[PDB]
Amino acid sequence: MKVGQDKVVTIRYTLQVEGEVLDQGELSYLHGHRNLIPGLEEALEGREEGEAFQAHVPAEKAYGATGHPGIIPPHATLDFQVEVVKVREATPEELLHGHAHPSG
Ligand SMILES: C=CC[C@@H]1/C=C(\C)C[C@H](C)C[C@H](OC)[C@H]2O[C@@](O)(C(=O)C(=O)N3CCCC[C@H]3C(=O)O[C@H](/C(C)=C/[C@@H]3CC[C@@H](O)[C@H](OC)C3)[C@H](C)[C@@H](O)CC1=O)[C@H](C)C[C@@H]2OC
Ligand SMILES: [Cl-]
Ligand SMILES: [Zn+2]
Ligand SMILES: [Zn+2]
Q1: 15 C-alpha to center of ligand 1: Å?
Q2: Ligand nearest to the CA of 100
Q3: Are 65 and 75 spatial neighbours (Cβ–Cβ below 8 Å)?
Q4: What is the CATH number of domain 1-104?
Q5: By CB neighbour count within 10 A (0-12 exposed, 13-18 middle, 19+ buried), where does 13 fall?
Q6: Where is the PPIase FKBP-type domain (predicted)?
Q7: CA pair distance 7, 64, nearest whole angstrom
Q8: How far, in Å, from the CA of 11 to the mean position of ligand 1?
Q9: Long-range contacts for 13-21 (Cβ within 8 Å, ≥24 apart)?
Q10: What spacing in Å lies between the alpha carbon of 100 and ligand 2's midpoint?
């Protein structure tokens, strides 16, 4: 099923800024509830389970002028390599809380 509003989505990601890897990992989030930076949620819209893609997110849709000191510099364009690992419906409590819960 496709990534979209009220889906719980699991992604693997690599983050680069100016060709340097800053982070890599995996996470699950509830889509459409401001869990992620808006630029990456936009790029995730309608993606299929199993789909791999790249997203280049301008600072205005990420960490902006401030960045995130210690990780993301000011005015950084974020280059993401993403794999959509899993997509499922959110449970009632996930929807109430506005976040993802583990499955086990
Ligand atoms: C206690 C809470 C910690 C909780 C941490 C986790 C679940 C672990 C999760 C793997 C995050 C990583 O931890 C190793 C690490 O991922 C980064 O390195 C990174 O690659 C990144 O940019 N990602 C992660 C991959 C999805 C896109 C983006 C994101 O949207 O991330 C989201 C994010 C930071 C959004 C902010 C929220 C504040 C807004 O103001 C700001 O708006 C400008 C946008 C993350 C997922 C939050 O939803 C949840 C958290 O924060 C950040 C550079 C710093 C972040 O560590 C903190
Ligand atoms: Cl979440
Ligand atoms: Zn919702
Ligand atoms: Zn909860």
Answers
A1: 11
A2: 2
A3: yes
A4: 3.10.50.40
A5: middle
A6: 6-64
A7: 27
A8: 13
A9: 13/80, 13/81, 13/82, 13/83, 14/80, 14/81, 15/78, 15/79, 15/80, 16/78, 16/79, 16/80, 16/81, 17/72, 17/73, 17/76, 17/77, 17/78, 17/79
A10: 4
Resolution (Å) of this entry: 1.9
Q: Is-contact 16 22, C-beta < 8 A?
A: yes
Q: Determined by which method?
A: X-ray
Domain boundaries, given as residue ranges, for the chain: 1-104
